[PDB]
């Protein structure tokens, strides 16, 4: 039921929670493609990696 | 809602309700491992797609 930090919000979350997709065609296009999600708010954490997936990843 | 209409038993949709994940190495290996999921049950259905994959891949 704790169902917060991997919801509508982990993918704002403060960069430093992810799970760092760690994908090699990370992009605003192939994470969010992969089941990642694109960050680029910060440079120096994973700028794609498993947050609010759920949008269309849960689906 | 109670992520189960999404979640297990949804990778089982009878072959029509998927997202095809339309990855270029579809695969019961890859799919399940890039975050889709591999049916292979009909090959006019996605042999990959966003099922239940909430499993690793909302997390």
Same mark, same amino acid.
């Given at each position: 039921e704790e169902? =917060?930090?991997l919801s509508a919000n982990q993918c704002?979350? !403060?960069a430093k929670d992810? =799970? %760092?997709c760690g994908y090699p065609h990370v992009t605003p296009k @192939?994470?969010?493609n992969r089941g990642c999600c694109? %960050?680029?708010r910060i !440079?120096? =954490?994973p700028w794609c990696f498993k947050p609010?997936? @759920?949008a269309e990843c849960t689906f």
């Open positions: 169902y =917060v930090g704002a979350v !403060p992810r =799970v %760092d @192939e994470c969010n694109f %960050d680029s !440079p120096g =954490v609010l997936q @759920e």
